[PDB]
Design a binder for this molecule. Sequence first.
Ligand SMILES: O=C1CCc2cc(C(=O)O)c(F)cc2N1
Ligand SMILES: O=C1CCc2cc(C(=O)O)c(F)cc2N1
Lengths: 280, 281, 275, 280
Amino acid sequence: NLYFQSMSVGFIGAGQLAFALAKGFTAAGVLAAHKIMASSPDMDLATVSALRKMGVKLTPHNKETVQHSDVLFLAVKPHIIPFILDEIGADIEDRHIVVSCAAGVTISSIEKKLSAFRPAPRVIRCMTNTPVVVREGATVYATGTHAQVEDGRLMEQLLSSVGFCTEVEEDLIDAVTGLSGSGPAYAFTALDALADGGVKMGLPRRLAVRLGAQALLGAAKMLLHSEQHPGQLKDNVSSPGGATIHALHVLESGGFRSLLINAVEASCIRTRELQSMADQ
Amino acid sequence: ENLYFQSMSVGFIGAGQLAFALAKGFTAAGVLAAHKIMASSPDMDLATVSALRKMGVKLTPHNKETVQHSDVLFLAVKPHIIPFILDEIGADIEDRHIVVSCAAGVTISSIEKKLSAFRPAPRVIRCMTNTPVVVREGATVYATGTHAQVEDGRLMEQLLSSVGFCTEVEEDLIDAVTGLSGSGPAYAFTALDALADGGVKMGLPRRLAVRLGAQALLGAAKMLLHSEQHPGQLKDNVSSPGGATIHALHVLESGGFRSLLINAVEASCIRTRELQSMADQ
Amino acid sequence: SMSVGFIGAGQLAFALAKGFTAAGVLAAHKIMASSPDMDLATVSALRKMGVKLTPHNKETVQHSDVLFLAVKPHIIPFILDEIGADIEDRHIVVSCAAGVTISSIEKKLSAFRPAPRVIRCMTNTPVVVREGATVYATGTHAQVEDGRLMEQLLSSVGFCTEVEEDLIDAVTGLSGSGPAYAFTALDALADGGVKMGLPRRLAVRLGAQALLGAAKMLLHSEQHPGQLKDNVSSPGGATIHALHVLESGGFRSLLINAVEASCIRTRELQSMADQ
Amino acid sequence: NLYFQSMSVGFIGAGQLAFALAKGFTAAGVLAAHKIMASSPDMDLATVSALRKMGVKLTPHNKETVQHSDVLFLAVKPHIIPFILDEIGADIEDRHIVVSCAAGVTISSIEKKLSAFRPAPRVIRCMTNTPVVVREGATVYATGTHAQVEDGRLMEQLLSSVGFCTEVEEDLIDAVTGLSGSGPAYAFTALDALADGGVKMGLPRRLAVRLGAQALLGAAKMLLHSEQHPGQLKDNVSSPGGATIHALHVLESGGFRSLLINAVEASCIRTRELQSMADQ
Ligand SMILES: O=C1CCc2cc(C(=O)O)c(F)cc2N1
Ligand SMILES: O=C1CCc2cc(C(=O)O)c(F)cc2N1
């Protein structure tokens, strides 16, 4: 029965991640929609039309978001961040907790820009994913130089309401991006392909999408609720000589495992290239 | 609640992974008391047989006892035992029984051929389910046989819906479902092991990497199930231009990721047909 | 107290006799072995070990209680004809020849005496250091003590368990051919150690020790091999980098391919036996 | 023998390797569990749970481990080493033998850090693996600038109680890491896949794991006990036209040998990359 009575949340950016989090927070009951405000330079986005139905306050002016908010999410593209922080930097107060979800934007770069206006800005770096929209996100966060102990606990409380959330060291966020940030896209790709396979073997497309999604959801839930190794759970499904062990062999023959390792690695490395442009 | 007060007796011929998964699921659902379940196995030293004991499921080495106890009888053995099994307990199948075959590839026609030699109208249902019934998130399909009453199919759907998704299909779809959701959880466990390796390669502790990858898959599956959206649209929606995610998608494409999962569904389906081509011939 | 014979005096005959005598279960002089080409190195090796040697297969039969068939499979028919009239009630015939079915042996021997006691066994060369992997299947007329006796004899030179005969082709692909896969892998690992600067001899020793220690860890753990893999792979470390390059090559699938190919070939040989 | 009467051993780090060595040492009889002390900054590790049950005295203060030890194993990740050498570098005494088991951490770098406190730190670099836990490890060590003759002898004796052990030049340690350090992980991968193959061909999983593990163990022991080349052993067991030579062909067709060469090389090269971060 969680609810933040004295918290006002702002989003700079009204893209997919801002909508997902606002929808998750409101569905979770931790935050009334009208105590949330978001700002975007494009008031004709599909997400902007959706936020208005929820009752989120919308404004085109970032300073308006900053002046309304206590917790301020930065959910914009990384190249705009230096211009955003210049724009609202003079408007950051002691009460503000700045939570950056911008891709590869480091705590150092945000604190350096904001400290030019006011010392000790309270900064938290967040890496979350879109399944927060169904309250099954995976979120990690790292606390900045000046964030109080209570700032991180508060952020963990809020982000726990929309999925898994834990604190990490900041130099793990690139790797988490490659795993759970990009993970949902890997799964959507897998689900489309599995459904194609279902259709090839004779299933209606709709049924094949449903079954494949249910299979993935159930397997993930099994693992989360098991203490056992994913290899052990795989062993339990694969009856000797059966259909499943035959299909696993053709996965192995294509290097299935290595493609997913490749993917995690490529997403993490790209995130570091973006962290470099942030720090350069 | 309705099924519970039916006070249904359930039997499993076969006490393996799937029998344990379903027994665990049904009891967790509250639809069945563990001691109203009976399971038989030719081998009592299995680990699944021991977990079944601890649950309080009744265990016996005698298939006839499982049959006589049961109202709904699950057949959960390898496809090549089924003719031996139906020969053994075919005389004991009563008009009141619903026979539910889970044995992969085994056709309704083959079961009814054996059982029709004893009672004339055996009630047979063919089922294809998976191991996540154990956490009540299974994916189940079933096809009703020649003599299954309309109420038999509804009862089956109600029972299997308590542990996951369940819907009726025509029987000629079941081998393809086997390739998709029957074998699906194993594809996912393989993917999760690999994603965790990738997380560990890039600096995460194994424990956290397992947790994050599993949470990622779960939330993405839930997202798809709750949206009317095409999975490619969801993929589009989350891949920002120039971003880390689209870079990772490219390397998946470059290895033919999609084709491997199609290959897998196809190989599992074809294998199931090969096992049915020894059930029939 | 028991007398053991070997029709055949090759790699598998020597490995078993060396294993048994090293184990203290059999005295070298209570073992006899027969061979045509009495000029194999393994023949001269059994000689130095104390095993009695004869060129006449019938003499081995007359000497033995338990009679191992360690010949190539194309020789089994020509052998069951030669000695089939010399099999007695007391004999346990243990076939180790590749893909030779219990059916084919009992059918040939039943033409001489009903109820021949036949056991089919699939073992491997590491019995020579008492770390073999053995499975056996009992025939139609094998008494209970026959299989119990077999398990006691073979357990002295490694792991041993009973299986249904229709699992033996798969076991061949796994533990029957497995030592060859490990020898190939050890040669390759040593090549990699030498490329990175190690002397060959140290590289062979280190690679073999690593494989021995890993195998023992798994046997002595209750844990899944993937779990042990997780335990050794430090985040960001050298091991997880090396596992990625194995995965990129389809390493796992090649070993699956191997077990499958060896099993399938064994089945092809069982076919020519069953005709 | 007398090397071990009244010897105390300490571990800084309670990860996988400190448990493996502690379990192996106590099972060997060379040390008593109570005479072993370990320091971990997080009692949440699963290994820290087991170490306590062994009777190994645990503590969070690394300085306590240093005070209580004669032979000091450093079993942490390589990037904490500069932090840990700064923490207890003043507590290193002439009596200490400092044994580094941190990946890629060079003797030069440890001696550089500790030479700023007392002038002649006794340092040994060690490369062991996890099968020390069943006393079948493969260990090599390199002796540093100030290690006495008895120091190498004592290390050899200690590590010989849990497996193979020999002295190498330090510049072979990266190559050994790639071979016997990563080796057990190659074997676990191979065993999982060999079991998958046995399962595909009809075997129960449990029997397939047992049989594959027994085959590998027996083959390795066979090679250790023969004077013969691994290729000659391969020849001896491959009968003409038989099942084994058919299986070897499909291994060759996938470049099986080259993958394992690739693996040793990749692990060695990564160790060199870590060695460079130790000297930067
Ligand atoms: O309900 C069922 C039937 C038995 C079954 C067998 C396999 C197999 O691997 O052969 C499977 F993948 C899924 C199932 N699920
Ligand atoms: O002694 C030691 C500690 C350093 C080390 C690191 C790895 C790794 O690659 O993660 C390894 F496999 C073995 C060792 N051996």
